[model samples]
Target: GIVVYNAQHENLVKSWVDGFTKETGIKVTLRNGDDSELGNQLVQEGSASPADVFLTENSPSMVLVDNAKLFAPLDAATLQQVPAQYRPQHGRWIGIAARSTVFVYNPAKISEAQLPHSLMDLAKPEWKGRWAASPSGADFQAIVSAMLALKGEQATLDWLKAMKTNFVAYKGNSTVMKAVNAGQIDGGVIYHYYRFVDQSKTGENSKNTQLYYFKHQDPGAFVSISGGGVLASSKHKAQAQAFIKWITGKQGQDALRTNNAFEYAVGVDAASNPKLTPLKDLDAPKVEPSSLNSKKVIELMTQAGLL
Candidate 1:
């Protein structure tokens, strides 16, 4: 019944689709792609795009399309499901789920006392060659944007320069987590779920690892909010809006909890998987969701030779 350009993990979104489709008997198509790729594609296609709805793993991509005026303002019913911070002042999109940044480390290699207290600590000389990151992608770029917001330009630039020397680049979060599991590095920067999903399965890729969140309202504790929106150009606006509304309601939020998605649900009164650290206890930094400027982050990371 709708075409969804889904940039979230396919399995996660598919579960939502299954639940929604089972209840509504609404046929749907999910074309999976990377967050930035689909966001830019939507902008390029503009009004010509056939997507009835769009979903992303992070908010910045949604913001990019919103800036291009491609997203319809969500109905109040859809907007009411999420809190103010997770939605944004513009209300063009709403957060469906969220993942927190963490340092996934091998406990055998890195003692509890040796762990970096903040993300910035990893940039120091002592941490050189001891940690890893995937710097050239949307997820990592979102973390950099948080760093830029909290530490300002000069500090963020210096940190990126330090990362160029101090950290090794892996291709993806799973790659980084697997490297840590194999003791290729003492630890790696990644979203918290990579380890959880692996642990939930066989613990093969995560057996040697444990995640440490940067405390003190640190940038590493920054929670990346996954976003969902209806496209302004969709011919099926009512159904598109309904889909957004359903996924944000109790039944859809329960779908996430039951399916082992492991992300924090932003829906009102939604309970997440018990294994996850509670969202309010994260002590994440105070950067506005809107201020996470991905374009500026990419430009500066490039200047620092991280790209």
Candidate 2:
């Protein structure tokens, strides 16, 4: 038996669980929650955590588990599926999937020629009261973490302060995207996969929203990776390892692509959703997963009076 603490896309996670059980005959139990809350829960549980395998929507949650010294080093074979840049250098966790940052804007509200040139530019006085963001969620925090890694503390803090005063704060990325589409705000920051997923369906909220990639190595091009790891304290180490192997392996990545989540697969030779721009095309910054300093990120957000 294995327990999976998952914060990835709900439908895709369900498909992976069902497929894994059918293929291996291992009984699996799943517990789901908001990303940060789940990470903190696992921290509180410590050695007593019932979770054997932990899966998260973004690398920061896995970074939290790794910082707590709760994760086991992943096997060499499983670690190789993703590129070195995508995984933590310590091998405490490995990325299984990825999503890139994008700016969604209403063409009617903001002309393409008038759009800000970079993500940091959104914090400028000209952008004041013209944008929106979802600061309370882990996805946005992961992007903020990247900013902290790429830009030093002072610069990041300055940007966050401007953002707090300039942008509308929302509940989550989907809400931010919806507001941008409805012209409630001119534009908002969100993951690329959200637009692809919604557009693949009935094109409901995404109809009027056009996505803009902040090219030229902007922090907005930072890719958020979902990670999976075995728990250092898990009683079912073998089962946990097996689950990670299966999930990051070729077969498991296929499950994600076919499941309609449209998240970029991290496994080698896995093709991303055709609707998305390839990862290499984005020219994203190269930052190690462990370099994602969440402590400083939250500190900066709080100092900016946004938290």
Candidate 3:
């Protein structure tokens, strides 16, 4: 049996666990939390942690554990299953799934042509009080981490400072999208799947909203990777390694393609759910997974009064 400290969506991870256990006969016990909770827990627990595997909804949490030297270097085959852009260059962890950043807008309030050409455009005075983001969440922080990586510190600070003035704050991406649907605000910065997930269910919260991808390698086009890794403190290293490999392989990747998770699969040759705009066409910036700096994003956001 292996204990997994899981920060990804519980249902999505459960689907993978069921498939993996059925195939390999290895038992899995999931202890779930949000990305920040589990990542910080692992760091605090150090080498004495009970978790054998750690999975997260964003790369920064993986980096949090990796920075603490708590993750084992993953198997080469597992590392190879995902592309270089999706995984950390150090191979301490690998991307299991991906989500792209997009502007979720109400078509009635903002027309397509009127959309900002770049994420940076939202910071201008003209856009003040027009856009929104869930600054307190890891999802938005991950997006800011990409901005820090691509735009440099001074530029990132300036943008966040302006963002503090220009954007409204929300507690969750869904709430931001819901507010857009209700026409309480014009648009919001959020991942692409929030709309898709809402559409899959009732479509009530997302029915009036349209998602716009800011491609052309812009920071808004940054794709955040959902990561999986074996803990260095594991008593079940081989089983932990196997779990990572299975999720990055065909069957596991297919689970993403066939399910309601709606996130893009990072596995090589793994096709995602058909309704998604293809990941290849996203024109996302070339950001190394490890290069994303959450620490700096936090500091910048705090200084800018966004925290």
Candidate 4:
């Protein structure tokens, strides 16, 4: 039996947990929270934490726990199943799924001809009050981390300062999309999955919006990786290790494909939902997953008054 501190979508993680328990007959318990919430919480708990495994919606949270030296090294076979770009250079944590950054715009509110070509464009004075984002959440922070990684600290800080004056703040991606779809704002910076998840259902919040990929290796084109790892403090390291292996393996990747999570699979040769634009064609900027520093991003966002 293992306890998973999950920061990914509950339904998606639940599916994976069900598959794992059925396959191995190892009982699993989940304690769900947002990426930074659980990441910082685990740091506070340290080795005394009861969590045997940790899963995140993005890599920076994984880095947070890994930086605390609280993660056990993932097994060789588990690491082997994931591609090189999706995981950290170290084997402590690996990517299980991926999502692209996008600008979701309401065509009725803003003409397609006038849309910003790069995510950086949203920081311009012309775009002031024209866009929105959930700056306090890990999803937006993960995107800001990519910006900080691609551009130097000064450039990132400057853009964020501009962002403070330019973008409207929302509490969550779904709300941001809702606002955009209702024409409350012209567009918003968000992950691609939000649009698909809404569209897969009634699309009540997303029907009026269209997703735009920055597609020029722009920092706006960054892809945030969802991560999984075992805790160093785990009493059930073997079960935790098997759990990680099972999720990143072919069977786990298949669950991501067939499930409604709408995130891309990172396993070697894994296929995503056909409705998604192929991950290969996103033209995302190359970023080291482990190098994304959300701690620094939070500092910058605070300085810019976005936090």
Candidate 5:
């Protein structure tokens, strides 16, 4: 038996819970909330928390827990599922799934040949007022964090300032996708799977939208990782580890594919949705999860008045 705190998409979390219970007969209770708020609560609860495991939509929340020293070192076998680049270099947390940054463009509004070559280029004067972004969410923040890591302080600061004046700020990635599909703006930066999930559904949200992979190892090709970890205070450490192992293992990764979750599974030998370009083919930057610095990212966004 285990108590799990999750901040990923509701349906995907539910499917994973149901599947885990059916296969292992291990009982689980799920508590869900927004990533930042839930992360704050976990920090407040500290060692007395009832949560046996914490799963988050992006790496930042996981990093919050890891910084607090609240997670146990994951099983070596489970950690082995993903490549070294995807998970924490220290082995505190393992990446379960990943989403790459992409520019969603309306083909009718803007030709493919005219799109910006890199994410930073969007900060250029020509792109002003022609794009949209979901700056408030963790996904976009992760991308911003990657930018801070790749580019120095001055360049990242300038880009954030430019983005504030240039782009339309939306509620979330889905909203950004819908806006692009409807031609609200020419295109927007978003995680790749948002389009995949929409297309897998009625093909309504992404009918007119096209995804462009910045495949030349551009900063836009930064892949954000979703992570899972066992709480240090968990009473059911064994069960918690089992559940994490299953999710990051072969069987779990396969389940994600069938469900059309649209994320690239980090598990070795795990196949992603066929419609998505293969991970290797994308020429994404080789950024390590541990190297990501979230505080400076928030500062930059805040400095630009986008926060």
Candidate 6:
């Protein structure tokens, strides 16, 4: 069995894992970790690493690893299943699934008309005390990375500074979601699935929540792609390629809709969970797939006093 360093949600990977082994008889095992944790671990281990493949919850870790030259170039057939924008241009890795950035707000406290048309508006003076964000999480960092890419360093810095002054700080996306639902904060930035997951269970935390999409290719509408790639040093390179291929392929994309993960499948013809806003409707900005610098984004966030 090949080892999969999976950073995607534990439950999300289960369906993929079961389907892979059942469909191909290519046995595998999982070692769960945060994207950056396993990424830096692979970099430090180099060719000596035990991992056969590396999976992620976002592209930044894939960006860091591909930049470190630790990932094998993905198979052409595998890359063909995913669209060009979701995967890196070099074809080192491919996007398996995606999540759209959403501004989660309490309808009781914030009206539909009062929502910010652009994510950048949260940094304005009028937005003070009206919003909250989890600046330290990878989910939020990816949004910031997209902001940095689309808007440049100066604009990103200014917005982060404004976030520090205008927004309440939360520790996790779920926490931000709860805060918004409870009316502790008017609204907060988070992925669309968080609200869906809670609603899918019972309308508990999401009873008062509605997500605002920052459409029109705005930075607020950034859709973060979760990546999967084979580690270049694996002894089971063939198995690794098959695994990632099966994931981005037709069967893998179909698994997304059948599973509880609720994340969007990035495969060219795969439809996401029907409850989600269609991918095209997001109108997200076109940030370079692998250009995000998590380290730099964190440094800027810390410097801006958000971290």
Against the reference, the lDDT scores of all candidates come to 0.89, 0.87, 0.93, 0.93, 0.86, 0.90
Candidate 1 lDDT (Cα, 0 to 1): 0.89
What pairs collide in candidate 1?
Answer: 1-27
Q: What are the per-residue Cα lDDT tens digits for candidate 6 across 196-281?
A: 88888987989999999999999989999999999999999888999999989899899888777789989997888898899898
Report the lDDT tens digits of candidate 1 across residue range 212-304. 988678989999999899999999898899899988888888877777768888888888888889888988887677777888898999998
Evaluate model 3: give its TM-score.
0.99
lDDT digits (tens) for residues 1-307 of candidate 4:
8999999999998998888999899999999999999999999999999999999999999999999999999999889999889889999999999999999999999998898998888778999899999998899999999999999799999999999898898898999999999999999999999999988899788889999889999998999999999999999999999999999999999998999889999999999989889889998999998889988999999999987
Q: What lDDT is reached at residue 163 by model 3? A: 94
TM values, all candidates: 0.97, 0.97, 0.99, 0.98, 0.96, 0.98
Once model 3 is optimally superposed onto the true structure by TM-score, how far is the C-alpha of residue 104 displaced, in angstroms?
0.5
User: Which sections of candidate 4 miss by over 4 Å?
Assistant: none
Error of 1 at 185 (Å): 1.3
The residue ranges of model 2 lying beyond 4 angstroms of the native Cα positions read none
Error of 3 at 221 (Å): 0.5
For model 3, how does the per-residue alpha-carbon lDDT over 5-75 read when each residue is reduced to its tens digit? 99999999999999999999999999999998999899999999999999999998888889999999999
Lowest lDDT block of 10, candidate 1: 252-261
Global local distance difference test of model 2: 0.87
- Give the 10-residue window scoring lowest on summed lDDT in candidate 5: 286-295
Candidate 5 lDDT, tens digit per residue, 1-307?
A: 8988987767777777787889999998889877777787889999999999888878878888788889999999888887887789888889888888999999999999999988888988899789998988888988887777778789899999999989999998899999999998999999999888888789899999999999788889998888889999998999999999888888778867777788887888888877778889999887777666677788889989998
